[PDB]
Design a binder for this molecule. Sequence first.
Ligand SMILES: *[C@@H]1O[C@H](CO)[C@@H](O[C@@H]2O[C@H](CO)[C@@H](O)[C@H](O)[C@H]2NC(C)=O)[C@H](O)[C@H]1NC(C)=O
Ligand SMILES: *[C@@H]1O[C@H](CO)[C@@H](O[C@@H]2O[C@H](CO)[C@@H](O)[C@H](O)[C@H]2NC(C)=O)[C@H](O)[C@H]1NC(C)=O
Ligand SMILES: *[C@@H]1O[C@H](CO)[C@@H](O)[C@H](O)[C@H]1NC(C)=O
Ligand SMILES: *[C@@H]1O[C@H](CO)[C@@H](O)[C@H](O)[C@H]1NC(C)=O
Ligand SMILES: *[C@@H]1O[C@H](CO)[C@@H](O)[C@H](O)[C@H]1NC(C)=O
Ligand SMILES: *[C@@H]1O[C@H](CO)[C@@H](O)[C@H](O)[C@H]1NC(C)=O
Ligand SMILES: *[C@@H]1O[C@H](CO)[C@@H](O)[C@H](O)[C@H]1NC(C)=O
Ligand SMILES: *[C@@H]1O[C@H](CO)[C@@H](O)[C@H](O)[C@H]1NC(C)=O
Ligand SMILES: *[C@@H]1O[C@H](CO)[C@@H](O)[C@H](O)[C@H]1NC(C)=O
Lengths: 296, 125, 277, 49, 108, 108
Amino acid sequence: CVNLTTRTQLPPAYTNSFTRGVYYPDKVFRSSVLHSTQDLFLPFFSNVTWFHRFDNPVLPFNDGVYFASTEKSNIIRGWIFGTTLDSKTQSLLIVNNATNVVIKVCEFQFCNDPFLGVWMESEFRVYSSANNCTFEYVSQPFLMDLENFKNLREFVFKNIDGYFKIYSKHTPINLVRDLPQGFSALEPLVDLPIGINITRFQTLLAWTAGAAAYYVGYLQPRTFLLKYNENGTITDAVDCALDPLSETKCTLKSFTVEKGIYQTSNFRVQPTESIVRFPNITNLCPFGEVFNATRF
Amino acid sequence: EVQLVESGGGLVQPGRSLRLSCAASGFTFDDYAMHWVRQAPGKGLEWVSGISWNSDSIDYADSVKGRFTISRDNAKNSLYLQMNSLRAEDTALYYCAKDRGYEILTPASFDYWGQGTLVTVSSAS
Amino acid sequence: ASVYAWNRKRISNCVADYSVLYNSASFSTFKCYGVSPTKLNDLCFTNVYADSFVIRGDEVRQIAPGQTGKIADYNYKLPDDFTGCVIAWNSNNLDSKVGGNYNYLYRLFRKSNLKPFERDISTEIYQAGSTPCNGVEGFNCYFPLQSYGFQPTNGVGYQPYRVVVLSFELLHAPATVCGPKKSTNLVKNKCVNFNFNGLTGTGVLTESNKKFLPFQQFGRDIADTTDAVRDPQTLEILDITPCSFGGVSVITPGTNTSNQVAVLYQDVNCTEVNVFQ
Amino acid sequence: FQPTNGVGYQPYRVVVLSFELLHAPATVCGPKKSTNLVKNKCVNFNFNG
Amino acid sequence: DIQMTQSPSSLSASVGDRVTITCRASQSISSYLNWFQHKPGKAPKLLIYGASSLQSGVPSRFSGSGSGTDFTLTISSLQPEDFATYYCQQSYSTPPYTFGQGTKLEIK
Amino acid sequence: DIQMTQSPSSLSASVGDRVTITCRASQSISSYLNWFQHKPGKAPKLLIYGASSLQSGVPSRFSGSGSGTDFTLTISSLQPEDFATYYCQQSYSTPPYTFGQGTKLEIK
Ligand SMILES: *[C@@H]1O[C@H](CO)[C@@H](O[C@@H]2O[C@H](CO)[C@@H](O)[C@H](O)[C@H]2NC(C)=O)[C@H](O)[C@H]1NC(C)=O
Ligand SMILES: *[C@@H]1O[C@H](CO)[C@@H](O[C@@H]2O[C@H](CO)[C@@H](O)[C@H](O)[C@H]2NC(C)=O)[C@H](O)[C@H]1NC(C)=O
Ligand SMILES: *[C@@H]1O[C@H](CO)[C@@H](O)[C@H](O)[C@H]1NC(C)=O
Ligand SMILES: *[C@@H]1O[C@H](CO)[C@@H](O)[C@H](O)[C@H]1NC(C)=O
Ligand SMILES: *[C@@H]1O[C@H](CO)[C@@H](O)[C@H](O)[C@H]1NC(C)=O
Ligand SMILES: *[C@@H]1O[C@H](CO)[C@@H](O)[C@H](O)[C@H]1NC(C)=O
Ligand SMILES: *[C@@H]1O[C@H](CO)[C@@H](O)[C@H](O)[C@H]1NC(C)=O
Ligand SMILES: *[C@@H]1O[C@H](CO)[C@@H](O)[C@H](O)[C@H]1NC(C)=O
Ligand SMILES: *[C@@H]1O[C@H](CO)[C@@H](O)[C@H](O)[C@H]1NC(C)=O
């Protein structure tokens, strides 16, 4: 396709995740209760890789991705998911272009730098060929404009039980070079019923370079204690293995603890290796005589 | 509800060739096996040839080996049968049958047939 | 299709009638895990999976939760908590050839047992030893795929069989595969016996504005008690309240003295049931 | 016994294996390799099965 | 090679009679027999595929039975539309689809 | 039609001998064979109905075996009251109750 090499080499930065990445784990309504659930969550106060200049390399997809972005002209268009991305294996494609939301599961021929070019958008050079197409989906019609930060968009992508689950949330923010310190609940958006194998992914951008950045975080199985207010919305959560006080809060099933000493769990030394001790006899058992006999 | 109409019946001399066709319209022709059956004027049914759902496996009867070449055209739902070096015993009635499965030599029988086209091998006027 | 390339068909948006499937006699094996076949009509499922493939006769038993075997480990694996039904029938009339049908393949060797419900398509040469294959078959280079020798003259236990398994999944989603049951008119503010997509139970369906419920259907409490449900026909948030409970305490003097009683229903505002409160 | 008998009437050769386990030194083991022995280290040992 | 034989040659019955047509196979064919009704004026039809499996589209009056080297076909009524020739075909041996001889049925 | 055949023609043994009489059927009869002992001076009797089922009232010395197209009958001792003619009868094919030829047994 088209190769762009005017990209300065910068090491990826890092930032504190704080308490971001909490979503509704299911579709049942609960109010004014403290519910404990086990699910793939983003750990509290984790390390989030920060990208900026045009930076969009291939990134892995282990168990989930917490994708966040703050922009002013919406440079990011969509996402690409797949394993080989060279028509050798089935791949997922999402493009939220200036027209609408288009989702395809066809096998594309992705070049070494899939991107979109642009005020109007004219260059559509993300892929070259498409064959053996299986699934497609378009959302309702809506038009969006091509032209410190004011809004923050954050997404969570999961792929389990042959279902592609997307959770999203959009909130205003007055920050520019820092992630907000606070709590925000993510509600589900779509649950694609497609059983793809995904290991790597990449992001699309739409010459003039814009000032924007996106944040990437990885989920892992964790236990959380969620607090629902009177209106059934999540207001606070406790990462249940972050520190001993969190474990105490999990044990007492409350967000406040009185003075005292509490028993939380049990410490157990784990084995390091294994040993096998058998006698060194090498003669074979007489099974041929029993089976390969002439007269019983 | 399926239709099977043939063509190519006539009068030819011994050793001369003539070409058959058979049109199928009432089903999906792309995933079934087809057979040709011979009915002597004063005898019983006899199997001649068969082709698979695709042109992969082809079998011929012993008495018609090296003389018949059964073809197939999945595009327009039509099969063929080229008979070469006809003799006087090949003046029978030929049917265009359909197999229940997708292979030639299977325990599956012939479910639907069609009205035959009579051929004669003689020197007449 | 083949064992290692088993098909999977998505089933949704159905008035699913399983009576015709039950009444058919063409299936030799008709076994269901966790669901009674006669009860499949009323139940509603969010999605239905249909997996079809062809295997050997002796391997029909291997298709079950917690089963071990060559095909069970290396080709197709069922979850231990599998629910649904299994359908299988012989196919000598269709999948047997006197010369041997060589269109059916199954895997012999692989690195390790595969996780339940996943497919293997790679046909790389298995490394049985230490000699690098480099794409060349030979010693210590075994092809993992073997072709079944299905012939009409073969034994009954070895005959080809076609397998179709139905798996039903249930979760908190709007069910789209239901049975042929007629939905009746709604009656509220009375003690009724409702049925909301298989959610059986009794109570009174008062109209409550519990919350927005933008995408949610059920509402739960401390115990596994559905408090509020969302109507499937229209879009409203009904509220379930169980019928009246209580106890019957009998106030009596000694039967030696006289024969009279006075009944007390405690924790009952018996405006609905010489009456006292 | 005759070669002309029916399938159910044919002779059959039967061999039955019975295993006994009790407080005795195990003597019939499988083809399992033996590793080294490590002391003063929490390990998962396998002494004669 | 396998030889396929027809015991009857010509049968006669009435509109309310019941006759049985039998077909004997020299070698075992394991219930893989087919019956065809060949009306002499038009294309033949199929009545029973396999030993005793009745094809959809024909009345359930006909019934077949037999396995191995002995087979039989019976008609319960012989209605005025059943006058035709019946053939038995095997599909199990190496000679592909060997047909038996005819069996004319004229009701009188 | 089915043809029923007798391999032996005439046999001779002793009071402490053991002989086997075999009967072959042209077509498979599926273990439906019967053996009869026809004493030439009086009415015949039945020894074994079916392939290997022994009728009550005769000694258990006799024993039959076979299925399909091959059958055999054996006498363990040939005691001085066993001199007679033995017939094998099939009861499975359309020709009803076809008998095989005789097999004289004179001990000497
Ligand atoms: C864009 O860059 C890619 C990779 O740097 C180029 O693909 C290479 O094309 C040459 C053809 O001369 C091959 O020899 C290389 O093996 C290719 N590399 C890869 C990684 O595939 C591509 O040609 C470039 N396109 C343009 C327009 O410059
Ligand atoms: C004696 O028994 C042994 C094993 O119990 C048999 O050895 C194997 O037999 C199978 C089947 O014939 C072969 O596929 C293997 O290659 C044999 N392995 C070895 C190491 O020989 C052996 O066949 C038996 N003997 C007889 C005469 O059957
Ligand atoms: C993230 O990792 C980098 C590299 O080790 C480290 O310098 C930084 O302090 C980490 N951030 C957090 C919040 O742990
Ligand atoms: C679909 O896949 C087949 C092979 O799986 C391939 O031959 C065919 O070309 C593909 N379709 C298109 C439109 O390329
Ligand atoms: C997904 O693809 C990768 C190839 O990168 C493969 O290693 C993995 O086994 C695949 N997943 C499954 C479930 O087969
Ligand atoms: C619930 O929503 C109402 C608005 O209807 C609002 O007044 C109230 O404060 C909300 N509850 C909480 C705990 O904020
Ligand atoms: C059918 O169901 C849809 C689902 O929302 C509803 O909108 C519609 O009113 C229903 N129609 C009738 C006649 O109940
Ligand atoms: C109980 O009954 C007996 C006779 O049945 C009577 O004599 C006695 O007075 C009674 N006592 C009381 C307290 O009623
Ligand atoms: C019982 O119900 C009546 C009317 O339904 C009400 O006025 C009364 O307060 C209720 N009793 C109590 C104890 O609340």
